[PDB]
Amino acid sequence: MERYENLFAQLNDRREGAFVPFVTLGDPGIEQSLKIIDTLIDAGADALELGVPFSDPLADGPTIQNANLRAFAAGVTPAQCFEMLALIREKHPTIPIGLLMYANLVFNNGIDAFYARCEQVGVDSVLVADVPVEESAPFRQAALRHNIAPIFICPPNADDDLLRQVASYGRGYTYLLSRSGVTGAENRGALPLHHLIEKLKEYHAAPALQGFGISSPEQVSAAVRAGAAGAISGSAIVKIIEKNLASPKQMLAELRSFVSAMKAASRA
Amino acid sequence: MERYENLFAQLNDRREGAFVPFVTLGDPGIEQSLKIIDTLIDAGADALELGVPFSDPLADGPTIQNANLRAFAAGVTPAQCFEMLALIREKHPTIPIGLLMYANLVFNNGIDAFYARCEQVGVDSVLVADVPVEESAPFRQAALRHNIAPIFICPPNADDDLLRQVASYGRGYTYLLSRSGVTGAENRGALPLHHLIEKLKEYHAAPALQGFGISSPEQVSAAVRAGAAGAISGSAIVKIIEKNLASPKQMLAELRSFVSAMKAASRA
Amino acid sequence: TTLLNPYFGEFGGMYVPQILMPALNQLEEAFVSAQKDPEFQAQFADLLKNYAGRPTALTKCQNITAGTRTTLYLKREDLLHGGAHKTNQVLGQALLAKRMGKSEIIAETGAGQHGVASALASALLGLKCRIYMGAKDVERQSPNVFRMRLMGAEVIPVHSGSATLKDACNEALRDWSGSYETAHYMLGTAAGPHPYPTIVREFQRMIGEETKAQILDKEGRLPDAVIACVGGGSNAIGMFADFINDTSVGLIGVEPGGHGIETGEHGAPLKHGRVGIYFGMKAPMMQTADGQIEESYSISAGLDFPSVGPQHAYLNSIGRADYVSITDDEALEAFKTLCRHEGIIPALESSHALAHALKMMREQPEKEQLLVVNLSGRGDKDIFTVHDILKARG
Amino acid sequence: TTLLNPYFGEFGGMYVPQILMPALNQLEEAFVSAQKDPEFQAQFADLLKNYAGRPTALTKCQNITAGTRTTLYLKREDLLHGGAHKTNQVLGQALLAKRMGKSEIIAETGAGQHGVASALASALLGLKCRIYMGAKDVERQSPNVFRMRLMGAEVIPVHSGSATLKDACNEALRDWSGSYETAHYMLGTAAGPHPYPTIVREFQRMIGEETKAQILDKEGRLPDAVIACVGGGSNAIGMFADFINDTSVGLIGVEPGGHGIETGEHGAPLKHGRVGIYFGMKAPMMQTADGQIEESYSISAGLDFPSVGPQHAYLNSIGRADYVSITDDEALEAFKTLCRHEGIIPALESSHALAHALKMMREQPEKEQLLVVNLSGRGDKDIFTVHDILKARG
Numbered sequence A, B: 001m002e003r004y005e006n007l008f009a010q011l012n013d014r015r016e017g018a019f020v021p022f023v024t025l026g027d028p029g030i031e032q033s034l035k036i037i038d039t040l041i042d043a044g045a046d047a048l049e050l051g052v053p054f055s056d057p058l059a060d061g062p063t064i065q066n067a068n069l070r071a072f073a074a075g076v077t078p079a080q081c082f083e084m085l086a087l088i089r090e091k092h093p094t095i096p097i098g099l100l101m102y103a104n105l106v107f108n109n110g111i112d113a114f115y116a117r118c119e120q121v122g123v124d125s126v127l128v129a130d131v132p133v134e135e136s137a138p139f140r141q142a143a144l145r146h147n148i149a150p151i152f153i154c155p156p157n158a159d160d161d162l163l164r165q166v167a168s169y170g171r172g173y174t175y176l177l178s179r180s181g182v183t184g185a186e187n188r189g190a191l192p193l194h195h196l197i198e199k200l201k202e203y204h205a206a207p208a209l210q211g212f213g214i215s216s217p218e219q220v221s222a223a224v225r226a227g228a229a230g231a232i233s234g235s236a237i238v239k240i241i242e243k244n245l246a247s248p249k250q251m252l253a254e255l256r257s258f259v260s261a262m263k264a265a266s267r268a
Numbered sequence C, D: 001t002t003l004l005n006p007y008f009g010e011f012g013g014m015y016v017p018q019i020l021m022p023a024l025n026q027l028e029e030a031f032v033s034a035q036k037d038p039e040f041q042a043q044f045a046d047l048l049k050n051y052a053g054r055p056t057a058l059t060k061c062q063n064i065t066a067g068t069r070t071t072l073y074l075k076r077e078d079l080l081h082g083g084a085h086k087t088n089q090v091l092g093q094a095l096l097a098k099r100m101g102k103s104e105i106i107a108e109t110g111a112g113q114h115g116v117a118s119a120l121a122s123a124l125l126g127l128k129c130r131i132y133m134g135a136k137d138v139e140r141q142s143p144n145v146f147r148m149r150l151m152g153a154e155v156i157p158v159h160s161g162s163a164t165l166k167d168a169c170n171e172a173l174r175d176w177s178g179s180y181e182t183a184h185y186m187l188g189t190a191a192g193p194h195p196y197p198t199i200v201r202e203f204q205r206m207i208g209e210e211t212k213a214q215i216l217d218k219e220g221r222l223p224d225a226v227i228a229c230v231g232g233g234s235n236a237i238g239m240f241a242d243f244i245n246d247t248s249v250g251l252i253g254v255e256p257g258g259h260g261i262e263t264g265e266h267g268a269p270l271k272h273g274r275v276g277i278y279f280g281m282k283a284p285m286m287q288t289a290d291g292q293i294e295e296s297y298s299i300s301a302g303l304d305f306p307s308v309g310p311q312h313a314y315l316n317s318i319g320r321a322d323y324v325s326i327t328d329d330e331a332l333e334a335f336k337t338l339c340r341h342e343g344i345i346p347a348l349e350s351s352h353a354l355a356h357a358l359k360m361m362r363e364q365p366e367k368e369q370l371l372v373v374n375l376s377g378r379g380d381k382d383i384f385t386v387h388d389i390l391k392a393r394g
């Protein structure tokens, strides 16, 4: 399908950036997670990035480590995540849905089979956190055979060859990394990204979404001003979950308030 | 003095063997030990062999190890033993008194001084358990300067050179060892000693007293029949002490009975 | 793009987040440079000789083989400084880190030996060392944790996941993802992303080089087989490397069979796991049916790496090396046997290799065979474990 | 009458009950015969090389001496099989026992290392080994006791006297007094009646022979001083022997000062005891004023022999060797220092020698001096002791 392309076209017609929250599917349980996701959309999310719980999430900081742990505490499996994804798509036909995966879960029972399942449930993209461009070939090929955009991370010091490859290989959006390290809400990015952004446009890369440390509305408006198409916030969203486990209602209200403010920062 | 020579002369005039018990001085306390010693004499002991408690009695089996431990439990020191010896001599002017020492106690504060103290209290001989003939020179010389007989052990396999040296170096009596190993009442000697005895007489050695494992009257009469001048019993006497600690009276009676029977076996 | 091939057949690769690729490429270039640099080689040789105690002895065990036609030698990595073979490659990696200008070392450890080794090398060579260790393993390896600290290293418990070695592996990579400009990740086995499987083999290959010279000296020919336990694969590839081109020499790798393969409680991914992608490489892994990584189980705490080096999976696939497993009880019997008959207390890791050689001998006692077992470490550390088990028996 | 002189000046001798003299004379004759027998020498050399791991490394410690004009090397007996130098001489004595046709070994031990060594040598060489150990020491050396048993030895607690090493020494001699026709007494230090001080030095002198070759190789000259701890005297006389005729080389022996000499709670009989006769020899002893033998006290359990070899008392009297003491706290500081700065965990016994070398360095940091410390053993065994003390502090 063309969900990201349609989105970015729409937002550009409104001079608006994308605001894309991340959560782990099934955190803190399946029913609550589905409610969390509908709340994120109703509050203004332009797309979703969704994690499938994995035993060893070696690119994630503690916040998302713990989201995975809560989801495993609820017995969440990849098959259950695919059932969730199908239901989310059935409720929301146009919003782009990207998965955040680790390689073993994609390769496990066949890379082509994993991408075919993504296409069947109506997922639009897949970022495999531990597959660098050098190892990406079978992943990007299977993604594209099944109408799934393979997403690549562009590190903030990426050299020219890397920029060209990320431009050539990715589709849907380019994940523009704010800083080295692992996911986390606390550590803000100290790097000027205007240059990477311009070079990405030069090479006709998919539109850039900035991520890592994106935790406040001002960072959303700054990413857009630097030329990115939008921003992704995950650890900050997940901390709202972690803080409100004892009150599901307050959890949804605080998620609503945060997403609303983040999305408001992206508007012209 | 000439106490052993006088004794052996007397016994020979009666065709009688010597019966010589051993105890540790001060076991189980000084007053009881003095009573034990007078009982041994009244019951018929012809001479006494007396141990000074030492920390590391490396030629003694458990029975005498424990006698030393009891004596140390009562605080017995070598100075107290010398006071005991003086009192025993003051009560009994002719009975020969031999000490069983370890070398450190003799060398400690001067070998000559130790022998001079023995002469002052009226001791007749000293057997230093861990001084073989090869190391005996300063010991035998000091003994003889102070009218103390140095006693040597003749092992049951002693070769001819050793027999000659034991004959030449010892005085008073020759300690005729029943068997290898360490003191103990239980293990009886399996060696014919008639040959060593004859060779000792041939070399004009001091009269032989058989010791180690001597625990019954029949062994006393057998030693005499083999040509020894007598026998020494120690572990068997010490076990009577060990068995009767809770009844000092019964202890003395059982010592009396045992010594009486052992001495009776030595009579023509 | 790399200087050296990151794959052994289908196995290996560099499956790390893009942010770590420059660290890997830098390390590979420094390693290739160091391997041609005679001053680096002389410095490594000097530490291995005068600090670590190389060469190690090759001991013939005639009491064990009496009455059979097996002759058995043990390569004595138990006599290496630190008590296990891991010391060879940490010295090499510490020198690599210094060649690259790095002042800090990150290392993961399970049973503690890799932590101790990396702490000693760091102490000797002036590097600031921090070690990650799953909290369950910290609790059960109090002795090793204190050794690391006495040697100046920082030991950081890891409470995520299963709180054991794989979770410490994750944590080391997370930290390195942010600190690679100043820190070198001193990985503890011949596994993980290229170039580590290659570096760790090359910095362990003196085991087999010395074994070859020693057996030719003493027997005038090569072994019929060299046998080594396989936790992650370093001691075994160190023994096997120099013999790979000697086609008559059998290479036997022994994985922990735990309570028995059929029970599922084992640590033998190479022969009984399923290929997956994790810890930077494609290789056979202990994993659930859905693809979650699981722990390896062994009576021996150091055969805990839940995967296996990609070079072993490759040598197995082409049939140049054979891999078998040995159970806890077989390893324990071999540990007892070596103590009583040769006066050498072997690590329970290494006892898995010895146990397989003893089966080769006892199964066919009149087969003429010359075997070398890599005695990868000493078993002082295992005395309590063995005691308590035998106490549960008498 | 003997073949060799049993005395070193006034010290030494054969003060045993007459029944043991033939055992001593037999052992001396067998030793003299063995020392001229090239087949015995080749057999001993072969075990020391291919079983024990000789020669051991000589390690320079530049991190410790940085900023001073001391260069320090450590002779690495910690890398010998068994983890301590005692392995050299038990192999030699086991061969002597076999040369005499004996099938059984008796040995005493305090901290357990001599028991472990005698059990390993016995296991390797087919001898039935029984070990005496004071019951207080059995209780505090559970690890070593179990190692002895895993190696087939019988361990017999001794409850007499103070139930520690001297009482086990007594018990070994009692047993030998009855069993010498079938058993050899494998005495654990360079002390006791002749010929043991002489045999044990000769079966340890490879330490100093290798040290001399190694230091000439590396520095082109002999050390200014070689430094070794003194429990009973074997590792020290092993280091010192080959240098005795090199008059420029200082020989420094370090006894345990315990809580401090003035406290009386120490283990330094050579410099602070009184000559006595015990355990078959005339030598300085820990003893009461009345002549009862007493225990040595040290934080290190293996510096417990309450006397000292007669050759040391002799070398001290003529002023060829110097003897000093080091307290528990000084030894502990040296143990910590070596761990942190060289990545080597030394036995607390050996830490007494290192501590004295560190004082030589720090007292006079611009004196040019080349020192060798005999690192007699590894300190894995001391980790808990050190931990608990530092815990009592923080």
Ligand SMILES: O=C(O)C[C@H](NC(=O)Cc1c[nH]c2ccccc12)C(=O)O
Residues within 6 Å of the ligand: A022, A049, A051, A059, A060, A064, A100, A129, A182, A183, A184, A185, A210, A211, A212, A213, A214, A215, A232, A233, A234, A235, A236
């Ligand atoms: O909050 C952000 O800036 C977004 C970022 N997380 C994501 O973009 C989703 C995510 C979860 N795990 C990974 C691993 C790699 C890339 C992205 C992710 C974070 O938590 O720092």
Ligand SMILES: O=C(O)C[C@H](NC(=O)Cc1c[nH]c2ccccc12)C(=O)O
Residues within 6 Å of the ligand: B022, B049, B051, B059, B060, B064, B100, B129, B182, B183, B184, B185, B210, B211, B212, B213, B214, B215, B232, B233, B234, B235, B236
């Ligand atoms: O009972 C005996 O046969 C006497 C022998 N004891 C002695 O003769 C006294 C003794 C005590 N300690 C020693 C040491 C050496 C010789 C003699 C003794 C014994 O107990 O076996």
Ligand SMILES: *Cc1c(COP(=O)(O)O)cnc(C)c1O
Residues within 6 Å of the ligand: C083, C084, C085, C086, C113, C114, C188, C189, C190, C229, C230, C231, C232, C233, C234, C235, C236, C302, C303, C347, C349, C350, C376, C377, C378
């Ligand atoms: C670590 C260790 C092993 C297992 O690791 P490998 O990388 O497979 O060699 C085996 N033996 C000992 C003694 C070890 O310390």
Ligand SMILES: *Cc1c(COP(=O)(O)O)cnc(C)c1O
Residues within 6 Å of the ligand: D083, D084, D085, D086, D113, D114, D188, D189, D190, D229, D230, D231, D232, D233, D234, D235, D236, D302, D303, D347, D349, D350, D376, D377, D378
């Ligand atoms: C036994 C031991 C010692 C003390 O005995 P010596 O006979 O004086 O050498 C010293 N260091 C270590 C490591 C020991 O095991």
Ligand code: NA
Residues within 6 Å of the ligand: C230, C231, C232, C267, C268, C269, C296, C303, C304, C305, C306, C307, C308
């Ligand atoms: Na494994």
Ligand code: NA
Residues within 6 Å of the ligand: D230, D231, D232, D267, D268, D269, D296, D303, D304, D305, D306, D307, D308
């Ligand atoms: Na001493």
